[PDB]
Design a protein around this ligand. Sequence first.
Ligand code: ISC
Ligand code: ISC
Lengths: 205, 205
Amino acid sequence: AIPKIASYPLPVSLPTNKVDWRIDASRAVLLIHNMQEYFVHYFDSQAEPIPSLIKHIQQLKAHAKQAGIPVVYTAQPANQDPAERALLSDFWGPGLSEETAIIAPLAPESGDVQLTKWRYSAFKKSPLLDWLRETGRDQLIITGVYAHIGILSTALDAFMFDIQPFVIGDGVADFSLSDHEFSLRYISGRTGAVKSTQQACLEIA
Amino acid sequence: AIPKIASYPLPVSLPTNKVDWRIDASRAVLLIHNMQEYFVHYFDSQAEPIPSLIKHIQQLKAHAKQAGIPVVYTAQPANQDPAERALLSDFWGPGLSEETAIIAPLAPESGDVQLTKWRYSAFKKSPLLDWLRETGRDQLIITGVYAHIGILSTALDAFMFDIQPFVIGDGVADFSLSDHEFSLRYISGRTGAVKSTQQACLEIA
Ligand SMILES: C=C(O[C@H]1C=CC=C(C(=O)O)[C@@H]1O)C(=O)O
Ligand SMILES: C=C(O[C@H]1C=CC=C(C(=O)O)[C@@H]1O)C(=O)O
C-alpha cells in the first residue's frame, strides 16, 4: 500500500549533476505529476513537506506561464478497468475510486493539458511523446509525487526518448525523506538533472 | 563512469515479494542482459560475484532450454552514432568501441535471439515487445548486469507493458552489494518478483 506518510522536511541540499544541462524556455514543458487529492491525502497536507512543495510548484507554474513554457498535468482516472490497470493491481490493489481532482492550489487552467495516467511513466498509454516531438519540445521539468515511483519512471522514459529530464528536488515529495533523497541521487547519477526550484526559476528566466 | 567494481558476494537472502507470481514455462522468456565482455570486464571475472553469477545464468539457460523457454540476449553495438546514442553520452561518454561479444561461458546458440541494445530498457528501439506479444509470452525472466540500471529499467518497462518481470537475485550483479540489494528491494516492492536461481529452476520444472 501507499503508507500514511509521516511528516518530513523537503531537502534543501541536492546531489551534484553529471550533466551541465540548463532549462531553456523555448525547449521545455513543465509536468505536474499526480498532484491529485487521492495521492496528496496520504500526507498530512498541513505538515512538511506539503506546504513548501505546493508553494514551489505554484511558483514554477507561474514562472513557466510567464516564460511561455507549456504546463501538463497527469492524473489517474477512478475505477480503472482491471484489464487496463493490469499488473498494478497486484502491487497496489484496485486503485482510486474518488479524490481524482488535482489539488486546488495547483488547479489546471484552460490552456494546461491534462493527461490520463495509466502507468508509472507518464509516457505509457498517452500522447505525451508524440506531443513533445510534434512541438519540438525536448526538455521535461518534472514536479509532483512520488519521487521514487512515477517521477523516476517518467524521467527514465523521457531520458530514453531523448528528452532531457529536470527533476525539481524541492518540487517533488515521496514516502519518506530517505526515499526522496535516494531518488534524487539516482536521477542525478543516471537519468536526468536535479535542480532546485530557485535554480530552475533562474534558468527559465 | 562505470567504476572498477570491487569484489563482493552475491546475495543469498532476497526480499519478500508483494506478488505471488510463479514462472510458467509456457509463458516465459529468459533474458540474458548485457553479458558482454565490455561490461563484465569492469569486474575481476575471477572474483565474486562473477563465477557464481555465470554458473547461475548457465544453469538457468540450460533449464530454460529443457523446458522450452526461449532465450534472448541483449548487447550494445560498438561505436554508436552520437545521434543514436543521444543523452547516454552525457552520462557515460561515447560508449564501447570493442569487447562487444557475449562472454564465452554464456555463448548464444543458434536459436537464441540476439537483440541490439540502445537504451537502459531492452524494449526501447527493439522488437522485444512485438515479439513477446506475437508469441503470447507474458513473463520475462531477467538476468545479467547491472541490477540498478538496465535490469531495473527493463523490468519497469516489462511491468508497464503487462509482462510479469522475474528478476533473479543471484542471477544479476551490480556496481556494489549495496546497489545490488537496493535494486532487488525496489523491484520486489514496485515492479516485479525477485526469485533465487534455485527457486526459478523449481518453478520452471
Ligand atoms: C503517484 C503515483 O502513483 C503510483 C504510486 C502508488 C500507487 C499507484 C496506483 O495505485 O496506481 C500508482 O501506480 C506515482 O506514479 O508515483
Ligand atoms: C550494462 C548496462 O549498460 C548501461 C550501464 C552503464 C553504461 C552504459 C553505456 O555506456 O551505454 C549503459 O547504458 C545496463 O544497461 O545496465
